[PDB]
Design a protein around this nucleic acid. Sequence first.
RNA 1: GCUCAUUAAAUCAGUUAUCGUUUAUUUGAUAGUCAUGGUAUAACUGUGGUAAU
RNA 2: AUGGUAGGAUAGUGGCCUACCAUGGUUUCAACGGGUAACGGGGAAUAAGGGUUCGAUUCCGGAGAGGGAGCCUGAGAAACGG
Lengths: 170, 362, 127, 113, 228
Amino acid sequence: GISRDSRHKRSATGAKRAQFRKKRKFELGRQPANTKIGAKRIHSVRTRGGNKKYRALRIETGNFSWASEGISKKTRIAGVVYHPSNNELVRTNTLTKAAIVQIDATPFRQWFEAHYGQTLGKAKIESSVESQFSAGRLYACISSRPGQSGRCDGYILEGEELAFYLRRLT
Amino acid sequence: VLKSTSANDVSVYQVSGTNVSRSLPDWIAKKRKRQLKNDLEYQNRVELIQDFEFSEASNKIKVSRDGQYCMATGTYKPQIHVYDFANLSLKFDRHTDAENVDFTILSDDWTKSVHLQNDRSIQFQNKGGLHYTTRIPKFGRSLVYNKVNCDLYVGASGNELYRLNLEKGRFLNPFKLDTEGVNHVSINEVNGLLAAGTETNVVEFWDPRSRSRVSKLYLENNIDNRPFQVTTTSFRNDGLTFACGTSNGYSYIYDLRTSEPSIIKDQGYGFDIKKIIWLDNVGTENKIVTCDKRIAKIWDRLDGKAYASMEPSVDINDIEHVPGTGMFFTANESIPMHTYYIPSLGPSPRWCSFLDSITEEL
Amino acid sequence: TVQSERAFQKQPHITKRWYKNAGLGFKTPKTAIEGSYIDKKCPFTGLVSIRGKILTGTVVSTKMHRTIVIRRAYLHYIPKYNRYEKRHKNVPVHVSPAFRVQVGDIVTVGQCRPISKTVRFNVVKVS
Amino acid sequence: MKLNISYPVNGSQKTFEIDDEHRIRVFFDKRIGQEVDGEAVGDEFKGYVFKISGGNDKQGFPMKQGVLLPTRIKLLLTERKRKSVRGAIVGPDLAVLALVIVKKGEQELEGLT
Amino acid sequence: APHHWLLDKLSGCYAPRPSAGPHKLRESLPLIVFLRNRLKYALNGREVKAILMQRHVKVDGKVRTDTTYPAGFMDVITLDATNENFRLVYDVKGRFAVHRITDEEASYKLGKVKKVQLGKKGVPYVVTHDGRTIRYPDPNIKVNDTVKIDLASGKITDFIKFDAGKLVYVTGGRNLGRIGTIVHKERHDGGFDLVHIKDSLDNTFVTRLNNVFVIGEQGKPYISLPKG
RNA sequence: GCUCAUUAAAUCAGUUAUCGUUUAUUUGAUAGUCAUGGUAUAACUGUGGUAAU
RNA sequence: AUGGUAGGAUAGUGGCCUACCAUGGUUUCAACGGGUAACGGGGAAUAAGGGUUCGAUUCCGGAGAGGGAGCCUGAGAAACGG
């Protein structure tokens, strides 16, 4: 399918267009699955004989980590918010690496109450996140490759990195 | 065949999808394992049609006007599936570089095949393998060829509207966009007026013989929750009245008298209006299909009451219709492609000649 | 400005600044540790390993973004004529935001698991 | 056509050549799995209940379970090839009609029961 | 056919290819060349097979039954017949040399480490040139050093750090395979370190640091070099 | 394995670099967390169709 | 075309591909372009113990299995004994 043969494009000095050989198997390329948010379907690819890759195409749940307390809780996925490479992906709700999403705040909420003894801004954390706990939708980012591992794994926004993205969302 | 009531007292008949199970996708492994391990009387009751389990549903589904054909736009190892209703299997299975967002057939029975790729490009596709590939300035959502003017002109999320002629194979003097909402393209059959789906809910009527847009039509709502865009449009085969489908589920039904009033009719969910097709060919006419992401619905345009609510469990994104019949082609997000037929709409076609008999006698 | 791109720039961290030594007697500058540039392709504080050719030359053109051109002059010896020929080899290299480079700028680089289509060398020392 | 009749309760099986068109007409447009009384087909078949099971046509192409279309078509068959497939539904161009006895009636067949 | 096998060009067309194994294939000498061809123990190729299946030969403390089994530099090849022990050592002129050693010298071999890292669960490990990886070495043992190996177990009884002024054997390059005990270590572009060597006639010779194999101190080598 | 149509920093030759990678076989290291479960292919037994496999 | 960054794809590097961002690259030290009958050339490799420089061996480079195009297994093929 996709070929990565470096010959056809021009040289540094402008020499070009040899077609020394035809396209072969080791210079291969396969295709993106623009994964969405839905009932989780797992794809199968056989790569270089022994190994395999996980295309993702529909994702329901994924594992996100809360960075302040360092705990990890599996997250139900709702919607896509921001991505820097192309905003066509967000308006089609497509997951890639470094993609801003919205999540359910209630799995991180249930950890906060019975383990500590407090509610969520009706044990001190940031102000811009504590107002988002009442909204039920927390903002999170992706730090995995769904095109390779198939998982929706990532990190929730905190710190000055929170202030960078929320400036873009207004 | 299971018969399902849509609670409209109009019995809806379905096949080939979420309820039909093919226990022998591979007869070499499973059906040899079925003989000593089962009686297979339920599988003896299951009647598959045209022999495909086909993942990664499809971006679009098309049918030909002649030969009783189907196009299917697979995305697994992204591919194009062609079906013959005479032979009931794959005739032509080609794999594509990137996904075609919308497909357009040239005039009939896939003499050619025209794609609208995720890479900003059209692929020309013949009987032979992958005859020509193009490049487009912007990304693609929809495309329509017109037999008149020999032009296949495209546009999505662009500042200009891109006018390519297939005679002499060029593009020159392209049209422009008013504030870049061009999600959809639809053409009048009789008089050839262009339809457009805009973020500010405007339909742009560009006359190709005048090289210029005629008028704007705006949408207003009684509830009016959010700023909405019309995602897909349609023209009647008569060329009289207009179909407008917004993102909030509210069907807008317009008149080509250059006149603003409409009739409103919503789905219960209102997630989107996916595809709108006029039932002007089939008897008991003036009906029109309105489909959500999940809920599909056909209703009389002057009456506005539910004749059928066509609801598969897995969500879809596509409708395709065979004229004179109730043959409905939907791309449910699964391995089987749920197509389904309502006989109380109209008679079954000639390849479905026994397929009408199996359900009423049962 | 640090955060001028469309994505948030950060080190992967494989002070709020993580450092490492590229080795071979190339010292970590003040701009590396107490700086503001992220530069995942930088020899110090980044994700490249200097192994292979450590070469030197003269920087001749700097008008690109985050990269420069080394001109590598030398003399060829032709055995047939028993003469010399003056030569040069214009090599483009990635420069890091720790080294103050203009036309001139005697430079030292290191082979860095080729970065982009001609760049095999990243700037590690400028004199 | 011929009726390849099997009786699995005893396990025996026997074919009957049937040349009369009144006898075959009951089986027309019936499908594999359907319950068929041969008492209209024959007086010695009084009370019998038959299920259609399989068979072939006059060119060897078998009826496959529930495909459709009582003409012949070509299918992608099981590493998969394409051969010609005769449909699931009984037509007059069948050389045979193999079936199976479901409920037994009054009279008996010597070589069968 | 390569240089260092001492085969004639005669006696048959095809050269006996080496098997994959511990040593590099161009560095290897197969056992078919070792038995019937140089030591003249067998005559035909089939006669090598009868010796191996009866397990007469053992290489480096293992049974080692294979016709084209790759034997390389510094390999104790113990033959159970004759009570004689053989150690391969390269000859200056470009070729390999079969050498007699003692029973105590057949106990130990020397091995150049090629790469050292930290294994799983915090375990140091060194990787010899014969591919013998050993858990828990001395942290003094670092890159390009030799390792004395017990061969009853995989243990390390002696180790010699690379320092200038110690008796070095060369494994590779043009000037491959002499004494010369060190001049110093040069740095160059791309690495390409040229560890200089001055022989018994005190003449400078230049090969790569990759080719350097430390076979002893200034004065003493740890193994019985063949004298001639 | 045979046959048809001529490439100038390309091939090739050596050289690295693989801390940029994948590897069946080769070799060397390396794992404390019901006297017998449940399925399953056929061959075969006999009936046939098909100009034919 | 030169590069930046982000994503994708891949066994992996990577403008490989695409967004967005800068205007660069090689060059009288000859870039780039043209001619090559490139059966000419490679110590690739022994060779001829006086035939004066002879030999044989290996390497060319690419494509194909009626023509196009798409695919599947396998460490490896984009395999014509699918």
